[PDB]
Design a protein around this nucleic acid. Structure first.
Lengths: 126, 171
RNA sequence: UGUACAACGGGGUAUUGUAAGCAGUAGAGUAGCCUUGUUGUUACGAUCUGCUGAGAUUAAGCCUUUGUUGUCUGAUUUGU
RNA sequence: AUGUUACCGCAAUAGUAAUUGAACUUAGUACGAGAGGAACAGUUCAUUCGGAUAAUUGGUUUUUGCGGCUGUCUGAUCAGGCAUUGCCGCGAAGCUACCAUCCGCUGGAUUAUGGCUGAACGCCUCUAAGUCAGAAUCCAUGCUAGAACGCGGUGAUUUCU
RNA sequence: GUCAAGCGUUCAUAGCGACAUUGCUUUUUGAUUCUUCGAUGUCGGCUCUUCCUAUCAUACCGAAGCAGAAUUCGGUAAGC
RNA sequence: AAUGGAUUAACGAGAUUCCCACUGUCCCUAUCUACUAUCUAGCGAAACCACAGCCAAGGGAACGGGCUUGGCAGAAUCAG
RNA sequence: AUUCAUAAUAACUUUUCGAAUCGCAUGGCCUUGUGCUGGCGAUGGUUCAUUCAAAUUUCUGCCCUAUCAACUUUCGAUGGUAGGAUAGUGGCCUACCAUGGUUUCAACGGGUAACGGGGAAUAAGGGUUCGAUUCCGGAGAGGGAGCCUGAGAAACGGCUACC
RNA sequence: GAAACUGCGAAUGGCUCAUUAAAUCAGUUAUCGUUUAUUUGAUAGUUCCUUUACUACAUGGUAUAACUGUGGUAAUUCUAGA
């Protein structure tokens, strides 16, 4: 079995207890009680009716539901390899990064290479 | 019922055909993002805790976030939203869904684990699927490894070896 | 003269729909104040909001009471 | 009124009640050249009638219980009176509804009819003697009242009267 | 009800049954005028019970010009 | 056919038909209220009255409370 | 012909544009550095103009009907002021105000086997008739309404609803 | 080099003539009253905003698809979950 919710009061409708209504547009309403039913037929607004759950929740009364959204104070904690880099050697080369004389000497080599490049290019142009 | 559970760090996933109707009555009347007890559903899941991610009910209509009901509804959905892909730019569309409350109407419930309990799970925790792709961007690789601003991502590159015939290559 | 009874009180359950009183930098606004504000202040002003799912009623043919206060020998008749 | 009073009972006699249909299945079978087209058992439901009951729903509302509304009176407010129960909305309890729900028994003797053996009438025949099954019938089971002149069992039966 | 010329393809009787005839009933309508004219309140409907059966249906059966279905005739039956 | 004929707007507590609405007229009844009835105190009539007050059949002035044969028959009584 | 183009003062902006893009080719200076500079392109990009458009707009012109003579304005009809909206003028819409506006020189209403035109048949001339129909402009996507995306649709071989 | 993201275009074409009788339409004017993608011609020394450490400019951050797989409906160019 199941329990349901009055359209008007928003109340548990234990089985059998209460009425049901089926408008021509196929909207199925349920009513715990003829009170709610009669108000509905009067075309009242539960948000204006005071004892109703809609008014309750629209005026923010009994607000023990929500508390807050949690936040984690840390990082993802994965400086992992990219599946083709061998993380051990990856960290080894990351540590070799400081004391950058290796890359500096490669730059100096390609630098004298650019020197000789302009030189030999001018030579060929001559 | 079925529990399509996932462990996102291991990247693993498995369906579990559940009974113990009352140990899923616990799951009844539950929203998305909420976390209930593995032990409460199953001592095989003792100590674990999941998070109700969502699920498909009968007629395959998924659970959508934010609507706050168990019953099905027809929403005039639009782009940038679950449960509808547009086959044209500008197309809004009316589709039927089920909402963000849990009940017997559901058939498959999609769960994600946030904590690993005391025991181990056969198809989730004992296994771990790898990262199918490596980062294709320079700085993403560089920060993923923690190298420097200048540590030559070009040579820290990923190389994924595959053989066409006997000729093999990393592409 | 008692796991006694009764009248009140209390609690519960139900019904109704948020009491009076106070306050408000709420309030259509209209008049008057001046140190003419930046809530300016003052008189009046439905109604609104908070205290308030508050208050009221609740066996009279509802339930229950570790409570209180009381009551508990008047008449008549009867024989194998 | 039966010796008194109280309790438990019997049960004479009288009354009596349950009724009909549909659907599925049997079965598109039987049967029928074809056309068409059954039935018993079984199941679920309903019609009519009855006897109760008020959990649910509906109705009713002097709970004159809560709130509100008009006019007027109580200096104003608060709170109230009058308006042949002033009016409206809700409204418990109680009553109540095929407008709601629940329930509505099985054994015997029999008719008609068909028969068993069987003569008269050396055969034959349901009949004459005997005898079987058989109906919404009849009587019992059951149900209602209990003879106020029908009965039984049991308990206690008055003192310084 | 009796009888049965005939109808019923053929056959009087499955079913009907002319011409003739014996009975029953008092729900008609007459006939009569016994009671009633110093008054028996006068049609129908509504309501409500009870009774008869010459049974419309329902229960069980028999017969058929009853293959089945449907139908017709007839019996116990006025329980419903 | 001024023993007036044929129409005739308007009017009618006139007679009649139909439609809309409406409805406890009805399916199908239920519930509520005041006044009664009811019980009491007190007051206190009337109509009517051969004698009185149980049925069946019979016959009989042809539909008896009485007679005949049967059935039955148990003080006094209240509300309806 | 302008309060035009355009320029400057003073501020406004929740902040607009001012290349983190891509293919080829690789060229030159030496201060010998991966220093500095360099080409042919594609893509996109603020403004202005242009072009294909688009929307509004001036004058003239439409078939038969008076067995349709008064029509329009409640709640826009005519104008004006202010404002809103528009991409833009403007009753397009609102607030307020004056009460006007069209009409026998046929208003308005009805009908149309009416979309209009360029044109077709037919003829001495004049003309009468037809012209949905290959080209031009309009309207529509089953009737209606609405709207997203977009430069551009009130899109329908796109969405939403009702019928 | 499929699929997919992205950018374009899908508002043209084509069909019919229902609508519509100062309305469309035809000629004829204007926009000194407006939008205009696209093409085409020209066109962004001035962007450090307590403008001194507030900030990489041999250049910065974020997914997310496709895909991996779990999959759910009888069905949908249905879609969620990781």
């Amino acid at each position: 079995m199941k329990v349901e919710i009055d359209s008007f009061s928003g109340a548990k409708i234990y089985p059998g207890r209460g009425t049901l209504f089926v408008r021509g547009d196929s909207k199925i309403f349920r009513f715990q009680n003829s009170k709610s039913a009669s108000l509905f037929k009067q075309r009242k607004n539960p948000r204006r009716i005071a004892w109703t759950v809609l008014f309750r929740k629209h005026h923010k009364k009994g607000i023990t539901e929500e508390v807050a959204k949690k936040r984690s104070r840390k990082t993802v904690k994965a400086q992992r390899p990219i599946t083709g880099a061998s993380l051990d050697l990856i960290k080894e080369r990351r540590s070799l990064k400081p004391e950058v004389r290796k890359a500096n000497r490669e730059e100096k080599l390609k630098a004298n290479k650019e020197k000789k490049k302009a030189e030999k290019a001018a030579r060929k142009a001559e | 019922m079925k529990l399509n559970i996932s462990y996102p760090v291991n990247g693993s996933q498995k369906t579990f055909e559940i009974d113990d109707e009352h140990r899923i009555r616990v799951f009844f009347d539950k929203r998305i993002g909420q976390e209930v007890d593995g032990e409460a559903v199953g001592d095989e899941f003792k100590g674990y805790v999941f998070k109700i991610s969502g699920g498909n009910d009968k007629q395959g209509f998924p659970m959508k976030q934010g609507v706050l009901l168990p019953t099905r509804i027809k929403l005039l959905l639009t782009k940038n939203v679950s449960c509808y892909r547009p086959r044209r730019d500008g197309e809004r569309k009316r589709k039927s869904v089920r909402g963000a409350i849990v009940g017997p109407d559901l058939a498959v419930l999609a769960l994600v684990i946030v904590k690993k309990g005391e025991q181990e799970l056969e198809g989730l925790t004992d296994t771990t699927v790898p990262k199918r792709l490596g980062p294709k961007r320079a700085n993403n690789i560089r920060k993923f490894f923690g190298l420097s601003k200048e540590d030559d991502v070009r040579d820290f590159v990923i190389r994924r070896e595959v053989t066409k015939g006997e000729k093999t290559y990393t592409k």
